[PDB]
Amino acid sequence: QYSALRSNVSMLGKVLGETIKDALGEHILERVETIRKLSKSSRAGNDANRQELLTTLQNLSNDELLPVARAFSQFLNLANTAEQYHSISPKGEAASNPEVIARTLRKLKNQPELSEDTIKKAVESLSLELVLTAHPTEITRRTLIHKMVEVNACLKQLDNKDIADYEHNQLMRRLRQLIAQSWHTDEIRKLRPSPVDEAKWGFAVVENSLWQGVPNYLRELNEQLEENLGYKLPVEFVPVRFTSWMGGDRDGNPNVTADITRHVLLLSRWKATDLFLKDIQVLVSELSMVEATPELLALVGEEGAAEPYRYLMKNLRSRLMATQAWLEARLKGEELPKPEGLLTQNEELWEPLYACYQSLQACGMGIIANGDLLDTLRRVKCFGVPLVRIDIRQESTRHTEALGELTRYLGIGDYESWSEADKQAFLIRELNSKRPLLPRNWQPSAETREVLDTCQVIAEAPQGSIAAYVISMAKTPSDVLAVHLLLKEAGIGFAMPVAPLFETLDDLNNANDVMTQLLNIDWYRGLIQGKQMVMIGYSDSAKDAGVMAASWAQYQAQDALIKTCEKAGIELTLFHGRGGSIGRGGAPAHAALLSQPPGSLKGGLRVTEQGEMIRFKYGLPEITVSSLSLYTGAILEANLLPPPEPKESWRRIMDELSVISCDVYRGYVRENKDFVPYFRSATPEQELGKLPLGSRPAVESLRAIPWIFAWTQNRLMLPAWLGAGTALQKVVEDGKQSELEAMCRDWPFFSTRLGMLEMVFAKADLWLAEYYDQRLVDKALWPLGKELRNLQEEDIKVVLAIANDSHLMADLPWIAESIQLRNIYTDPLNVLQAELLHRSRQAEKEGQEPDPRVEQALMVTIAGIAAGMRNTG
Amino acid sequence: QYSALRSNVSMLGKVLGETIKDALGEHILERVETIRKLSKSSRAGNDANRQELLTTLQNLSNDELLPVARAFSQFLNLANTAEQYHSISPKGEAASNPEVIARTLRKLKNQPELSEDTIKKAVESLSLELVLTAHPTEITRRTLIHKMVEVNACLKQLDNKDIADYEHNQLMRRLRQLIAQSWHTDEIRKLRPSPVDEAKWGFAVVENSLWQGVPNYLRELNEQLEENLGYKLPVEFVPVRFTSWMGGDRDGNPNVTADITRHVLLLSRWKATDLFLKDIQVLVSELSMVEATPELLALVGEEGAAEPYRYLMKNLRSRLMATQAWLEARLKGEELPKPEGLLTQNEELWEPLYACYQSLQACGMGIIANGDLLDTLRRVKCFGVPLVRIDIRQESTRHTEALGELTRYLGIGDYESWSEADKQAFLIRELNSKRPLLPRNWQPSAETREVLDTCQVIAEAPQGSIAAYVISMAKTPSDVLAVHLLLKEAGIGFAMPVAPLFETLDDLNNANDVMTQLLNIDWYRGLIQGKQMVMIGYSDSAKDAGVMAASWAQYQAQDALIKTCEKAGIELTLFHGRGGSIGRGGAPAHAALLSQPPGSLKGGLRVTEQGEMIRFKYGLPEITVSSLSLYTGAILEANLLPPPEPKESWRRIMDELSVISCDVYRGYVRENKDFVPYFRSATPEQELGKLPLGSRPAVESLRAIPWIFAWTQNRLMLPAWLGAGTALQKVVEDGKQSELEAMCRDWPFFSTRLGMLEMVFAKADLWLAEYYDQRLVDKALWPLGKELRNLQEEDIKVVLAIANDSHLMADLPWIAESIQLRNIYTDPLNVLQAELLHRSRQAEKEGQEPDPRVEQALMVTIAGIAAGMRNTG
Ligand SMILES: N[C@@H](CC(=O)O)C(=O)O
Numbered sequence A, B: 001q002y003s004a005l006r007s008n009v010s011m012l013g014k015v016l017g018e019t020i021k022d023a024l025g026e027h028i029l030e031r032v033e034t035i036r037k038l039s040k041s042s043r044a045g046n047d048a049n050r051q052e053l054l055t056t057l058q059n060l061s062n063d064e065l066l067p068v069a070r071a072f073s074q075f076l077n078l079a080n081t082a083e084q085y086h087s088i089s090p091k092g093e094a095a096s097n098p099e100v101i102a103r104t105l106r107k108l109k110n111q112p113e114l115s116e117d118t119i120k121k122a123v124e125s126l127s128l129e130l131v132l133t134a135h136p137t138e139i140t141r142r143t144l145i146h147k148m149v150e151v152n153a154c155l156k157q158l159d160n161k162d163i164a165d166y167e168h169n170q171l172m173r174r175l176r177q178l179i180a181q182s183w184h185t186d187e188i189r190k191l192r193p194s195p196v197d198e199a200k201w202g203f204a205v206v207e208n209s210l211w212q213g214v215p216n217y218l219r220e221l222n223e224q225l226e227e228n229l230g231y232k233l234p235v236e237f238v239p240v241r242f243t244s245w246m247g248g249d250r251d252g253n254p255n256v257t258a259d260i261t262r263h264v265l266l267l268s269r270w271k272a273t274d275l276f277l278k279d280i281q282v283l284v285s286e287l288s289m290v291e292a293t294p295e296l297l298a299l300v301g302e303e304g305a306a307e308p309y310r311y312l313m314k315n316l317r318s319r320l321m322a323t324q325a326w327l328e329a330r331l332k333g334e335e336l337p338k339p340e341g342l343l344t345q346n347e348e349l350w351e352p353l354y355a356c357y358q359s360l361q362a363c364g365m366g367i368i369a370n371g372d373l374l375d376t377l378r379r380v381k382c383f384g385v386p387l388v389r390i391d392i393r394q395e396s397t398r399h400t401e402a403l404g405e406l407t408r409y410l411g412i413g414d415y416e417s418w419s420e421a422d423k424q425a426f427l428i429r430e431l432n433s434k435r436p437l438l439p440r441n442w443q444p445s446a447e448t449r450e451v452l453d454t455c456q457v458i459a460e461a462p463q464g465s466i467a468a469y470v471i472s473m474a475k476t477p478s479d480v481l482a483v484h485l486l487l488k489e490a491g492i493g494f495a496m497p498v499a500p501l502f503e504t505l506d507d508l509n510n511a512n513d514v515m516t517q518l519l520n521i522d523w524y525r526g527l528i529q530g531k532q533m534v535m536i537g538y539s540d541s542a543k544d545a546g547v548m549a550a551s552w553a554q555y556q557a558q559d560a561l562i563k564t565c566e567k568a569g570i571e572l573t574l575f576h577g578r579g580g581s582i583g584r585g586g587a588p589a590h591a592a593l594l595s596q597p598p599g600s601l602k603g604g605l606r607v608t609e610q611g612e613m614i615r616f617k618y619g620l621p622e623i624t625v626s627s628l629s630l631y632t633g634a635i636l637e638a639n640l641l642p643p644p645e646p647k648e649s650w651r652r653i654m655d656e657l658s659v660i661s662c663d664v665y666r667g668y669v670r671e672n673k674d675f676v677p678y679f680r681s682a683t684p685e686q687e688l689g690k691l692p693l694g695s696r697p698a699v700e701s702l703r704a705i706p707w708i709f710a711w712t713q714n715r716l717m718l719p720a721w722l723g724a725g726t727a728l729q730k731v732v733e734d735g736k737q738s739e740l741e742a743m744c745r746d747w748p749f750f751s752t753r754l755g756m757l758e759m760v761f762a763k764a765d766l767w768l769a770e771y772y773d774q775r776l777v778d779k780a781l782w783p784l785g786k787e788l789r790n791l792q793e794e795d796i797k798v799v800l801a802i803a804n805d806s807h808l809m810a811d812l813p814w815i816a817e818s819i820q821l822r823n824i825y826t827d828p829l830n831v832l833q834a835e836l837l838h839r840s841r842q843a844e845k846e847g848q849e850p851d852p853r854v855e856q857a858l859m860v861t862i863a864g865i866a867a868g869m870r871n872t873g
């Protein structure tokens, strides 16, 4: 079964080892082989080999550090590519086999009490919007997407049995070339990337995978609809849209200025012109058809009425080339009027393209119409003019300060002192006011000016470039009303979707109250035009209260909001954030989406795909088809077959669990006096902040990402499990274990919550965790480490006991197996990383010079460990 | 065995039939199915179905003609692509399996009396130069190369056994798209192509196949050298070069003016810039290596000494972009000074590229150096700056007139009246003269000015753009001396290779005499710098005297020339022309090259690849590797293992054969009074002249091409067999059959000559031939037709008797089989073509209007028949 995968990893590793021998050494290969041996030994109890391991690492010269690190990082890299190849190959788990869609559609179709029209309308109302996010540990300076597409193509071809030995030889020769490139093509950011750089990586994902991936997803989905149900969605219906937060999210990031966003907004347009030209060229040459309709001929009428379809593609070609030229100037900083055929809306690309499609169908050229034209048609609506719409995100606090400084300058009062009823009073008065408020030539502070300039970019940008304004830390109705006032002042002609982001236990708790007041304001209700979009901050609430309380809190807030909006007639859209069980990808994800309160996906799927998981969910075009197909079935099933409502006793088990768990979690994280000092020593948290990892500049202070990432590198995974098990053991100790087991079998929310601990417990590593304490933590803090490690050992038993199994995550053997592989490949990077942190941390203590070798090897481990661990939050 | 091929043709035909049903009809499919049935019946003797066939064709409306024709043309097209796919697939004849090289190298290596150094120097002196020629029946307006690469890729992928049904489904969906494109993408020249258009098709061959093909050929050849012999050729040795006659050959073509050549010369440079940029971009991003040599660092020294290889690739990128810009202006007709980094020589691309290679090897990055850099390195020397050097070609007569008009204007005398000793006298005097001769502001006639302007282009063009000046119809030493005088007058700074083209039996006969006089002129001998290049006009001499006399005449002239130049110390290079057994491609070709007089390829292989055979020899990159590999073994074997010298009695059998055969051939073609009238009626010769087939404007008059092509369409193949058999039967009738059989077993020249008749007799078709007489020829000319057809029936027996076989070409079963397939697919185009010629020819007789439908269907048959028949001369 996993034999083929085991063979490929072994094959790619020999090739790497070959390349390293050629490269520079047999010595480094020995540096690598001694470290694995010693590490395996040490773990298996040999305390003499632990000594040996410690001396071996300490004797590594600084010149050996990076090459050794990169080696370990590379072996892991081939392991993941062997892992991902296996996943889409038909003689392996086969993630992109269209049965994934059909299995879901068959289930529905033969489910009594499910009218076919009920099914058809759910189909016709599908909607997915995937919001790309930056990768927090992207270490190189150029995107590697395209090389990966290539290694994968080579593995695909070597899979053909009966391949003539010469073909085999040829394939292996390129494979060695491609691996060598990676060992020698070293790039390492020296400096913190910038929002433009991160915006650029998203364009790389779009062109190396989404560009082909989306249209294929749409063809397969369509072939399946018609096969299983008897009808194809209409050409005009493209249910997928991609959006990006890159150069749009300034929450906590001073480097994302209104100037940067302006810039990135332009760049996207430039890149869409680039990709759309490649599509249009193809079309200009293949559309030599001369048979056309009255309507189409009319549309050209003479001049090009002797090459009709070609005509309309040539016109578009110029129109695209003109706008390209204009944006390359603006990118450059030059201002010059815009050409007559400047492209700003998708309708401008759609229209002509759709006209050709229509005649070709009408005139008997169906097959040609449904080929590359169809693909460009779907890409216009999926990507269009802006390529990827961006989302703007700023904290609520920042809006309050801007509007406070404004009010004091006008002598009206001080907004950040007024009670909430006064703020709404002031906001509704001004929102209805016809006289401006923003002083024409004002002198605000840097911060305020930024808030003000950003809304001017939004307002200045063509409609459909910006998908939504997200308000992180939204706590009251004035928080939402505040951005509508600023946008009004910025001059905006359309209705911009504003979304509160509730990301704390109380804000989640108060969320429903906050929106019912907002919908009771008649002015607000008519401004949103029957649609609201809320954002649920799972990851931050879990930082606040622990994962159990956060999950139940989020469960309750969505159910309350779904019901509130339904009473009020508003189409609610839940915007999902980062991690959680909805961001696990694959089957768990599909289980997860279905485990949400009934109603939850009635207004669509909108999620924040984590940066570090992009390669694994959209890395190759076939993975994109898998990912979109999985999501698509989930929506459909969740909307026609919602989960049951919880048995009241369950609710009381969850209330309690939530209190015990939050109580234990805060016990340690907030109340325990040794925790912060422990944390800072045991995890590479401080270094993740100094090093040039994300574009943000170098426990309540911290952000979800750095909280999660730091514990992931240490291997304890504290954030993702902490009070859950403790609370669960206690409830069992009351004899309620039988109810916990019923909740698991019959309540999707609950099994899915327990499922997720299993995977975290599956990647955590207590031997490694203990090793960092031994090397990095002061002796007096060891007891706390031992305590937290023992908490986990006990939490795995309760979880295994409730799950009635003896092996963790036994329902997902392929995920289990793949986690087993990466764990062994990741092993040596954690062993090495501890030495680097030690060398690094002692240089500082003794006012030394950040050695560049030591720092770069550390960035390699960080990024390798993060890649081997994937999702851990 | 041929099962897989039979399956694929059936598969592609169903898909075509599917597409046509969708398209416009079930009626046309019936138009096609009735015509094959009736045609098969008629042939098999049913004279009632022959009547039915005749009425069926006559009842076709003019609106049915083209679609019916195109259908038959398309089925043939899929048949050839199934045929060509099978040829390179490892589970079929496998043309590009590197054993082709190794088999040859093994043979050599273990051949006693063959020192390994003798072998190594032959290796180090290999040299191939393939001169591309236009396609005489290219009917569409855009090159289809690239689509064909794609259909082939799709067949390759469907060959994988174990292909998951979804993959299979996906592949078939594109296949249907691709076929549909061809049925609906109709383009048909309305007008005669132009030299630029034909120059453009050669660029299409270069980029869709030679660009990848050459470097692969070079890697395989290199891997084989080292495997079998123990050494690899050095990086600086690229033994292949491609040249084109497109926009260079004006022999007989008024449309190829000096202006056109100037233009085409520029365009090639533009296109090389285009392809070289794609290579350089790749290099600019993959060469991130920072480890470099003193020498390389020196070469950059600071500025870019922190990204050395990238630096040199970025410099070249600008340099290429600059020259591109300059040629797009010149192409446009604008004159503006040339940029500082204008590229004119290959050394300018070589140099930097080679520097990177050197450091990468030196610094341990061998594997990266030997990858894409190696490929660009080899392409520079194979294609370089000009992309494809062109060759200029003008008749000798035209030079005599230009120089006659010149002399009369100066009052010196009249060159075209002076005896040959006087012409040489005058020419040597002026060639040594320091005072000019060409009047500064003269008024010649159009013709003369063209001769004069063309030499000015040659002279004006950068050195290495023009490979040689070919003199068609060269008869005496003054013919060669004449072009050296004109070139001198045109101002030329380098030594341009001039080559006489002997293309008549007497000129072949006199060839040796002509060159010994030329080498006895001390002035000439020192001007050519130890190198002469002669051109052998097989195809035209055969038009003159028939194929046997021509072949023996050519055999004798090369042997005489090889010997003459060897005595004189000149490196002779035989330039081969069109068709003949050297242009058969594949194994016959390899046999053919080896059957030439010893010495023959000592100065390399230079051949004129026929236009209509390009798809079949260089159509896909893998076919190019096959073709170059076959040629390469032939050179090596021919140079280390020459054929035996003929037994004197053989020579006398050949003299006689040559006289009898020429005698019979001229009997019919020149002396017979009914022949011309017959010819013009039975073949589409006149129409091939009117229709927009080649770029030349709309029996001694005629040219090889039109002589051959016309008889190929009729199916009799007269030009390629005519007196051969007649002469052979006569010699058997003297009891010398036993000597003819010995000559065949032991004399390569002879078996190869008889081999070639077999293939012509294999594609000829006497039933079809008779059908054209019945439909197109007047009753009184029928007897001549019957006579010529009966000549052939008798010639096949003598040939089969001498070959001791009962089935034609029994030593080449795959070629035999593939000829069988195409013959059945071509069948209906000949049946249809006869009706078109009838309708066309009667419209004219009755002063009607060339109906465009009738003419376009005719162009389709012409081009289809020419494609099914491939090489027939
Ligand atoms: N994404 C997997 C874990 C992994 O593949 O590393 C899960 O959510 O369970």
Ligand SMILES: N[C@@H](CC(=O)O)C(=O)O
Pocket (backbone or CB within 6 Å): B583, B584, B585, B588, B759, B815, B818, B819, B869, B870, B871
């Ligand atoms: N090129 C083949 C004939 C063919 O393939 O049609 C030969 O020279 O014998």
Ligand SMILES: [Mn+2]
Pocket (backbone or CB within 6 Å): A472, A473, A503, A540
């Ligand atoms: Mn937050």
Ligand SMILES: [Mn+2]
Pocket (backbone or CB within 6 Å): B472, B473, B503, B540
């Ligand atoms: Mn000629």
